Amino acid sequence: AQRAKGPATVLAIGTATPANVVYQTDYPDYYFRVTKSEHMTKLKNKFQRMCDRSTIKKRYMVLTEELLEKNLSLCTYMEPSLDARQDILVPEVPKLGKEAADEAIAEWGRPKSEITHLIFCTTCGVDMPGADYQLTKLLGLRSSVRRTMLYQQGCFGGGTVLRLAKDLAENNAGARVLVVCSEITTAVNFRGPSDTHLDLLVGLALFGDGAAAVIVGADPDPTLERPLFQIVSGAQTILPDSEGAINGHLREVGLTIRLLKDVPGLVSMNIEKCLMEAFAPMGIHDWNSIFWIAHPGGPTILDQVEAKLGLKEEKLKSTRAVLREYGNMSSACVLFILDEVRKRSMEEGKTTTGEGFDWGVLFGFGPGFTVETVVLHSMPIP
Amino acid sequence: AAQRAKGPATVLAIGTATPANVVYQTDYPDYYFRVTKSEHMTKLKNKFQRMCDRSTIKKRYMVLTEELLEKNLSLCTYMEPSLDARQDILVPEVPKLGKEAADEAIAEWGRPKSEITHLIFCTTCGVDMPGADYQLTKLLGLRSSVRRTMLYQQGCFGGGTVLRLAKDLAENNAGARVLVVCSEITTAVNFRGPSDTHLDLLVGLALFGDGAAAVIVGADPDPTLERPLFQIVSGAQTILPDSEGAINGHLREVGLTIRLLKDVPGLVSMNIEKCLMEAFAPMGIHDWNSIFWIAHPGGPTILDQVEAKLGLKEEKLKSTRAVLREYGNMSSACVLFILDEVRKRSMEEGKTTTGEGFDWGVLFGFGPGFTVETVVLHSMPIP
Ligand SMILES: CC(C)(COP(=O)(O)OP(=O)(O)OC[C@H]1O[C@@H](n2cnc3c(N)ncnc32)[C@H](O)[C@@H]1OP(=O)(O)O)[C@@H](O)C(=O)NCCC(=O)NCCSC(=O)/C=C/c1ccc(O)cc1
Numbered sequence: 001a002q003r004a005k006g007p008a009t010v011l012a013i014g015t016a017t018p019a020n021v022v023y024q025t026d027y028p029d030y031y032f033r034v035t036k037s038e039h040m041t042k043l044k045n046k047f048q049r050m051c052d053r054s055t056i057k058k059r060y061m062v063l064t065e066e067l068l069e070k071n072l073s074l075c076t077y078m079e080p081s082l083d084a085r086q087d088i089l090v091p092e093v094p095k096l097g098k099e100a101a102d103e104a105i106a107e108w109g110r111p112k113s114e115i116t117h118l119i120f121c122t123t124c125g126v127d128m129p130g131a132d133y134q135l136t137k138l139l140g141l142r143s144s145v146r147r148t149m150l151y152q153q154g155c156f157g158g159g160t161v162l163r164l165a166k167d168l169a170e171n172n173a174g175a176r177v178l179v180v181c182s183e184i185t186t187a188v189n190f191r192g193p194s195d196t197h198l199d200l201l202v203g204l205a206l207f208g209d210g211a212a213a214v215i216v217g218a219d220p221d222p223t224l225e226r227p228l229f230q231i232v233s234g235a236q237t238i239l240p241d242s243e244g245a246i247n248g249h250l251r252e253v254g255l256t257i258r259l260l261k262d263v264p265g266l267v268s269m270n271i272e273k274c275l276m277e278a279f280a281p282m283g284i285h286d287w288n289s290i291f292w293i294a295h296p297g298g299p300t301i302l303d304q305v306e307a308k309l310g311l312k313e314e315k316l317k318s319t320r321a322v323l324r325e326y327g328n329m330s331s332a333c334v335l336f337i338l339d340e341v342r343k344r345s346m347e348e349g350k351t352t353t354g355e356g357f358d359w360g361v362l363f364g365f366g367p368g369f370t371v372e373t374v375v376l377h378s379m380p381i382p
Numbered sequence: 383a384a385q386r387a388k389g390p391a392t393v394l395a396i397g398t399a400t401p402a403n404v405v406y407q408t409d410y411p412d413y414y415f416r417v418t419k420s421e422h423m424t425k426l427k428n429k430f431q432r433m434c435d436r437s438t439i440k441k442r443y444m445v446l447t448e449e450l451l452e453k454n455l456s457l458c459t460y461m462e463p464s465l466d467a468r469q470d471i472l473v474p475e476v477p478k479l480g481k482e483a484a485d486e487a488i489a490e491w492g493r494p495k496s497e498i499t500h501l502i503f504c505t506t507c508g509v510d511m512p513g514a515d516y517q518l519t520k521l522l523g524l525r526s527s528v529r530r531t532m533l534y535q536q537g538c539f540g541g542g543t544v545l546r547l548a549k550d551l552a553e554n555n556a557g558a559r560v561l562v563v564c565s566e567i568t569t570a571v572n573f574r575g576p577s578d579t580h581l582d583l584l585v586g587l588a589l590f591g592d593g594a595a596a597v598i599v600g601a602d603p604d605p606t607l608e609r610p611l612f613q614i615v616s617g618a619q620t621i622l623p624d625s626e627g628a629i630n631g632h633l634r635e636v637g638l639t640i641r642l643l644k645d646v647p648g649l650v651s652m653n654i655e656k657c658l659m660e661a662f663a664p665m666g667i668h669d670w671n672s673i674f675w676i677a678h679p680g681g682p683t684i685l686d687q688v689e690a691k692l693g694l695k696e697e698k699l700k701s702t703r704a705v706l707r708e709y710g711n712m713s714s715a716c717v718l719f720i721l722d723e724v725r726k727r728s729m730e731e732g733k734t735t736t737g738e739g740f741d742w743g744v745l746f747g748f749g750p751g752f753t754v755e756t757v758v759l760h761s762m763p764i765p
């Protein structure tokens with residue numbers, strides 16, 4: 001007694017974005033006009049080809065042109081701008097998180113009065129008390145909620161929350177977990193004018209804004225609840241020879257991020273061990289008998305892994321589709337793909353929530369270099 | 383059968399560490415107003431001096447020495463740019479002091495670091511990518527497959543926040559042994575005295591010191607390889623009614639600016655009885671002298687008021703006030719600093735238990751929210 005019986009299960013997935021839709025075929029011109037950098041045609045040609053090959057069609061952004069008119073230090077590179085970003089992030093991150101959590105509880109079907117725990121994860125902004133307290137007040141959750149604040153974990157937080165919510169739901173009987181990952185990549189936005197920092201541009205051509213939420217609980221009551229995926233295990237590892245792959249320093253100019261390693265080649269040369277160690281308890285070594293959710297850090301990191309593993313084109317269709325219509329939304333991005341995996345599984349009438357396959361993987365890649373591999377099991381679809 | 387442990391998560395080892403520079407309280411009002419060049423503020427000086435004399439603190443260990451102040455002059459300075467000047471200090475020095483404590487807790491543990499599966503790193507000081515959980519993983523030589531959890535900016539209730547997280551980590555994953563490190567180098571507050579517009583930093587600078595503590599926690603301890611000390615029975619977190627903005631710490635280009643709106647001693651007093659009633663209800667315990675006490679030493683008055691309202695004997699907060707006396711407030715690491723003290727004192731005097739001769743005990747983390755963390759512990763037998 002006192003503790004749960006079976007595995008953690010995701011019971012609802014809600015997504016939320018801002019109203020501003022920004023098409024990528026226009027974003028180079030916008031970005032070099034707003035920044036007033038029309039004279040640097042070298043970086044303009046470079047940033048253009050970045051967005052052209054990013055496979056992204058549209059992205060949602062809190063940062064409007066008006067918000068930059070009122071926060072002109074964000075049209076600058078290495079000028080003091082931390083307060084200008086935090087005056088946006090501290091309020092705007094819980095607000096987008098409430099929208100996604102409300103969509104998730106709406107699918108959940110049960111009142112918020114029974115949410116026992118809360119895990120909030122963001123890389124954008126930092127404050128005391130954390131965005132978990134802000135979301136608890138904004139959503140009106142029980143004041144008895146016991147919260148976990150994951151600050152500045154990076155694009156692998158989406159698997160961290162699942163690996164943590166499994167133990168929270170399974171070690172406390174009748175506990176239900178509100179998981180929210182809300183990221184506003186206004187944490188990443190500087191003036192173009194820098195031949196001193198070109199990785200800033202492939203970061204601006206890929207990231208977008210959005211919030212995702214799930215409800216996690218063990219031993220679901222199959223009258224009020226509908227199971228979607230059950231989290232069998234969650235793993236975290238440090239890739240060999242990956243020291244300094246991504247370095248993010250939070251200074252008075254915001255979070256400055258610098259890359260030292262070729263990340264897509266690092267993920268490719270090391271992912272097969274992560275699939276082998278995670279799928280060993282089941283005896284699975286064919287990665288095309290598995291449904292796939294991997295954080296779309298970029299087009300080619302999925303391209304190279306898809307080539308190194310010899311995967312079919314269908315495996316990463318949902319991943320690439322979230323990168324297409326939403327882009328990179330950091331940690332929340334993998335939960336978006338979880339939702340698309342379920343939505344497309346019904347739209348195309350496949351046997352189970354994971355496009356027809358029993359077992360599935362959730363990959364989150366971030367600083368370390370760190371790979372979070374989470375193995376899920378599907379739910380049948382009648 | 384299943385892939386999980388069968389009993390409760392127990393504390394297996396404890397280790398603490400403090401920097402070398404010792405700063406005595408009977409010498410702090412003068413030196414502070416000299417390095418900031420504020421000897422023209424006789425009011426704030428007498429103000430600060432009475433605070434230091436009423437803090438019941440004797441000494442504190444500090445990383446920010448005067449040698450460090452002359453090379454970062456933005457810290458002799460209130461609200462001019464000072465974030466990077468502390469970032470250059472907190473980012474490396476926080477994991478270093480954490481390993482200092484994790485080394486001593488591993489030495490007492492007696493088992494190799496390869497058997498440390500999970501890690502929780504907790505600090506309200508500084509932010510970096512990758513986090514301090516990565517820097518300790520590399521410094522301590524733990525396995526690359528360690529599953530880490532980063533608690534950034536959790537305030538002074540992190541000590542109970544991590545016990546609540548480490549309880550589930552050790553009770554779901556069978557054979558798991560979770561190392562938890564709370565490393566607080568509270569230099570984030572050293573502001574220039576010149577502020578008649580900010581008296582709360584004074585009583586934030588007359589209490590807080592630096593220190594780090596680390597525990598090994600795991601369930602089903604092998605009684606032939608490990609020695610249990612405390613059983614983490616329950617862990618709770620709650621926001622007190624009518625506490626909006628009690629502790630507000632914003633991160634600005636000039637550092638972490640903390641301002642107080644509500645009296646947190648009277649916030650803790652009027653609510654501590656409800657937390658203890660709810661926490662000990664499954665065991666029918668209502669005598670708060672029947673229980674051994676670990677309360678976060680926010681200050682002398684917060685403890686004084688809890689002791690007055692609940693009608694406790696003076697022995698209950700002896701170790702809590704002793705950690706406050708010789709270390710000051712160290713944020714989340716204090717309660718674990720107190721945890722080490724209770725087991726030392728309880729074998730100093732040959733008590734019946736590891737909690738001063740008591741079966742059940744409580745650990746309290748108070749912080750921004752206002753959030754109070756109530757962790758019920760059970761002592762283990764001592765011969
Ligand atoms: C971005 C790539 C390189 C795609 O480009 P490509 O297909 O190999 O070649 P392209 O014709 O498309 O041109 C674009 C790339 O060309 C590369 N390039 C240009 N000059 C040359 C040259 N002389 N020779 C060889 N190649 C060249 C260059 O790598 C540039 O990408 P970037 O590194 O961002 O500048 C590919 O590596 C990729 O998609 N990787 C996955 C993307 C990815 O993981 N992004 C995030 C990395 S880590 C993270 O989470 C955060 C990063 C970030 C960082 C800063 C921020 O402000 C915000 C965020």
Ligand SMILES: CC(C)(COP(=O)(O)OP(=O)(O)OC[C@H]1O[C@@H](n2cnc3c(N)ncnc32)[C@H](O)[C@@H]1OP(=O)(O)O)[C@@H](O)C(=O)NCCC(=O)NCCSC(=O)/C=C/c1ccc(O)cc1
Pocket residue numbers: 432433436538571581582583584585586587629640641642646647680681682683684749
């Ligand atoms: C400070 C108190 C009042 C004990 O002092 P006292 O012995 O009762 O009175 P004193 O004669 O020693 O004078 C000092 C205190 O007296 C109070 N006081 C003074 N002037 C008067 C007056 N005209 N009339 C009535 N009373 C007065 C006043 O509260 C002042 O403290 P402070 O709030 O810092 O200014 C008491 O509030 C106390 O110790 N509480 C526990 C300490 C505590 O919880 N600290 C943490 C709070 S929240 C946190 O985590 C962050 C704090 C922080 C905040 C800012 C930072 O930069 C850094 C950190």
